[PDB]
């Protein structure tokens, strides 16, 4: 699992 | 009467939300006076985010690489810099809708309103707490980074949170408005995990006082307890220790209801040890811990802005 | 990820809120174009409210008896009339902040955002459902009448609720913006009681789909059920009957998750018959019924305004 | 018990 940076 | 998870009115913040695009990466920014604040990972590409060197990535950009849109108006970027994990984009026009504001950093246990946004446009508003492990249990999708958390006092918006990222457990991590992360997290797509969380005891007590103010009294009892004997029960149930400062902060609610804080602690002990036996408190079958004592007084007394 | 009770951004409504005083009675009004809408019991005195004759009470007033304040600006009343249980106060200036808007009446089971206000000033925002018994479980204190409930679609505010009063059980009753009460209530301080309430089944199913979308899957099972066998269980547990139209409305969430609606009904049957055995769904130990299928899609897909 | 009209 990894973190998700939430720009788009 | 009634008790709801209640957010601050969001109009003052809505007027500050903009869209920031760099390349194919779009997110939200906060436009105050002539600066736009946004998460620095707007400068990343898909391949950049495992271990970006943000200093390198930023040196390779200039002002014209940042497209900022306030509604249907494009804002010209005339300066850019990095401050910890946020970018400051200086623009050539000051936001005429800038409210009176402060940048404050909050403590675990404190609450705030979140204005969730996509492409610079507000989507919805909800209330959050800073967890003891410095995560927040938000509702955020791809594109929500740059959405801010805030409190309002009188006419002044105190910004305390800017959203960056989602951990694998589905909880969220972000920075204060100076770009400094809450908790031991970094803006990279790596394996990171929150520390173990705990329940915010003073808040549970505040919510029990709200329940009494609203006529839910079934959990009350004639018992009292000592602060030391209570804290032994809190440790066993993964609750934060209660301090004398917490007892003091709860003073006003204690006086309003006539139930002493250590008397209410006796109720909480019994709820922890036996559950609710199929009953509910303020519509909940769980002990709620995202209302502060301030939130309770604010809502049960009708403070406005 | 994440799922929160999320309200619409309130700025468009904040710009419409005013204060209306008649005598010593103050409450909120809604200023759209050159009309201010407010609950007609602003014209009551303390002795008037057991059985007011509102027609009589209004004939005895003139325009100058209504003091309307928009912020620090007093608005001159140039006309007044009664429409069912609201007053229409015509003022001499149109609200420059009037949004695109509609007056809509909602059905039980539908949700909306409430902007709670005191003395014309917003205090907080939260999400509500119209209960099957036409009450709402709000958070309202003395002075909150005239606060409105609303939904936003694109740029258009659909007003659906204006707050009037609190029933003895602590729940709330009000009108649409044409002044017509939701449910069998009247704006008098008499003994009135809500009819028995029930749980909004289609909403519970929608929230179970939200839970699956967010990774809560423990309540799923391999069983299916028939719509008739399900509705026999719903009747026993005080749930509203599920219709084929409900099954159809849940279609999109069913397709997104791959769980057939009648398969999810089998889960709900088991939760009703056995409880959760100490587990939680989306942070709740109770079956939540104030999210519509639209609310779920909206929040899990990031619709903005 | 009675209803309470919530003007102020």
What is the C-alpha separation between B228 and B240, in angstroms, rounded? Answer: 13
Residue C279 near chain B (CB below 8 Å): no
What is the C-alpha separation between C178 and C160, in angstroms, rounded? Answer: 9
What is the C-alpha separation between B95 and B113, in angstroms, rounded? Answer: 22
Helix and strand totals (H; E) in chain C: 8, 13
B191/A4 touch (CB, cutoff 8 Å), yes or no: no
> What is the residue whose two structure tokens read 């269980």?
C233
Structure tokens at C105: 């009446």
φ and ψ of C228, to 5 deg: -70, -45
Structure tokens at C10: 């309130």
What is the C-alpha separation between B120 and B17, in angstroms, rounded? Answer: 5
b/e map B228-249, b = 16+ CB within 10 Å: eebbebbeeeebbebeeebbeb
B82 DSSP β-pair partners: B87
φ and ψ of B14, to 5 deg: -55, -40
DSSP 8-state code for residue B54: H
Closest CA to B96 of B183, B148, B158, B32: B32
Report the phi/psi class of residue C274: left, alpha or beta, with left for phi > 0 and alpha for psi in -120 to 50: alpha
Residue C173 near chain D (CB below 8 Å): yes
D2/C25 touch (CB, cutoff 8 Å), yes or no: no
Q: Residue C30: is it exposed, middle or buried by C-beta count within 10 angstroms (0-12/13-18/19+)?
A: buried
Structure tokens at C139: 């958070």
What is the C-alpha separation between B3 and C3, in angstroms, rounded? Answer: 20
Between chain A and chain B, the number of residue pairs with CB atoms below 8 A apart is: 61
What is the C-alpha separation between D4 and C44, in angstroms, rounded? Answer: 13
C191/D1 touch (CB, cutoff 8 Å), yes or no: yes
Determine how β-strand B35-39 pairs with β-strand B86-91. Answer: antiparallel
Closest CA to C145 of C44, C246, C228, C50: C44
CB B158 within 8 A of CB B145: no
What is the C-alpha separation between B145 and B19, in angstroms, rounded? Answer: 11
Nearest 5°: the CA angle B1, C146, B116 is 75
Q: Tell me the longest C-alpha to C-alpha distance in chain D.
A: 20
What is the C-alpha separation between B272 and C90, in angstroms, rounded? Answer: 57
Residue C118 near chain B (CB below 8 Å): yes
What is the C-alpha separation between B58 and C73, in angstroms, rounded? Answer: 48
Structure tokens at C79: 């006309």
Closest CA to C120 of C34, C28, C38: C28
**Residues in chain C, overall count:** 305
CB B52 within 8 A of CB B42: no
D3/C165 touch (CB, cutoff 8 Å), yes or no: yes
B165/A6 touch (CB, cutoff 8 Å), yes or no: yes
**SS3 state at C74:** strand
The technique by which this structure was obtained is X-ray
C175 interaction partners in chain D (CB closer than 8 Å):
none
> What is the residue whose two structure tokens read 């942070």?
C283
Structure tokens at B288: 């709620």
Q: How far is CA C113 from CA B4, B38, C176, in A?
A: 12, 28, 14
Contacts for B305 with CB less than 8 Å, ≥ 6 apart: B8, B9, B152, B153, B154, B155, C121, C122, C123
Q: Which long-range contacts (CB under 8 A, 24 or more apart) does C280-283 make?
A: C280/B286, C281/C207, C281/C208, C281/C211, C281/C216, C281/C219, C282/C3, C282/C207, C282/C210, C282/C211, C282/C214, C282/C216, C283/B137, C283/B286
C95 DSSP β-pair partners: none
What is the C-alpha separation between B252 and B236, in angstroms, rounded? Answer: 28
CB C262 within 8 A of CB C254: no
What is the C-alpha separation between C172 and C89, in angstroms, rounded? Answer: 25
Q: In sequence order, what DSSP letters do the residues of B59-128 get, joined into one string?
A: HT--GGG-EEEETTEEEPEEEEEEETTEEEEEESS--TTPPEEEE--PPTT-EEEEEEEETTEEEEEEEE
Q: Tell me the residues of chain C between 144 and 163 that have a Cβ less than 8 Å away from chain B.
A: 144
Q: Tell me the residues of chain A between 1 and 8 that have a Cβ less than 8 Å away from chain B.
A: 1-8
Return the partners of chain D (3 or more C-beta pairs < 8 Å).
C
Q: In sequence order, what DSSP letters do the residues of B191-251 get, joined into one string?
A: ---PPPP-B-HHHHHHHHHHHHHTT--TT--S----HHHHHHHHHHTTBPPP-HHHHHHTH
**In this structure, how many other beta carbons lie within 10 angstroms of the beta carbon of residue C218?**
12
Q: Do chains B and A touch (3 or more CB pairs under 8 A)?
A: yes
Report the phi/psi class of residue C264: left, alpha or beta, with left for phi > 0 and alpha for psi in -120 to 50: alpha
Resolution value in angstroms: 1.8
What is the C-alpha separation between C57 and C78, in angstroms, rounded? Answer: 18
A7/B168 touch (CB, cutoff 8 Å), yes or no: no
Contacts for C74 with CB less than 8 Å, ≥ 6 apart: C67, C68
What is the C-alpha separation between C216 and C271, in angstroms, rounded? Answer: 14
Q: Tell me the residues of chain B between 42 and 61 that have a Cβ less than 8 Å away from chain A.
A: 42, 44, 49
Query: Which residue in B9, B71, B121, B274 has the most chain C C-beta atoms within 10 A of its own C-beta, making it the best mutation to test that interface?
Result: B9
**SS3 state at C243:** coil
Q: Residue C297: is it exposed, middle or buried by C-beta count within 10 angstroms (0-12/13-18/19+)?
A: middle
Q: How far is A2 from chain B (nearest CA, A)?
A: 4
Q: Residue C14: is it exposed, middle or buried by C-beta count within 10 angstroms (0-12/13-18/19+)?
A: buried
């Amino acid at each position: 699992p990894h973190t998700v940076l939430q720009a788009v | 009467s009634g008790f709801r998870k209640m957010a601050f009115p969001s109009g003052k913040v809505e007027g500050c939300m903009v869209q920031v695009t760099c390349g194919t990466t779009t997110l939200n920014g906060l436009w105050l006076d002539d600066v736009v604040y946004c998460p620095r990972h707007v400068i990343c590409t898909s391949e950049d985010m495992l271990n970006p060197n943000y200093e390198d990535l930023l040196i390779r950009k200039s002002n014209h690489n940042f497209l900022v849109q306030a509604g249907n108006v494009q804002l010209r970027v005339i300066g850019h810099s990095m401050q910890n994990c946020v970018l400051k984009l200086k623009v050539d026009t000051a936001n005429p809708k800038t409210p009176k504001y402060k940048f404050v950093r909050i403590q675990p246990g404190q609450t705030f309103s979140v204005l969730a946004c996509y492409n610079g446009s507000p989507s919805g508003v909800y209330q959050c707490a800073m967890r003891p492990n410095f995560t927040i249990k938000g509702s955020f999708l791809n594109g929500s980074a740059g959405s801010v958390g805030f409190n309002i006092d009188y006419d002044c918006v105190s910004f305390c949170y800017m959203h960056h990222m989602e951990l694998p457990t589905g909880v969220h991590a972000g920075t204060d408005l100076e770009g400094n992360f809450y908790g031991p997290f970094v803006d990279r797509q790596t394996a990171q995990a929150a520390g173990t969380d705990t329940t915010i005891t003073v808040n549970v007590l505040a919510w029990l006082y709200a329940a009494v103010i609203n006529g839910d009294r079934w959990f009350l009892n004639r018992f009292t307890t000592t602060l030391n004997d209570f804290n032994l029960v809190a440790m066993k149930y993964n609750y934060e220790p209660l301090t004398q400062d917490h007892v003091d902060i709860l003073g006003p609610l204690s006086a309003q209801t006539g139930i002493a804080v250590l008397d209410m602690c006796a109720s909480l002990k019994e709820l922890l040890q036996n559950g609710m036996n199929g009953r509910t408190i303020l519509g909940s079958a769980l002990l709620e811990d995202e209302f502060t004592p301030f939130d309770v007084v604010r809502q049960c007394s009708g403070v406005t802005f």
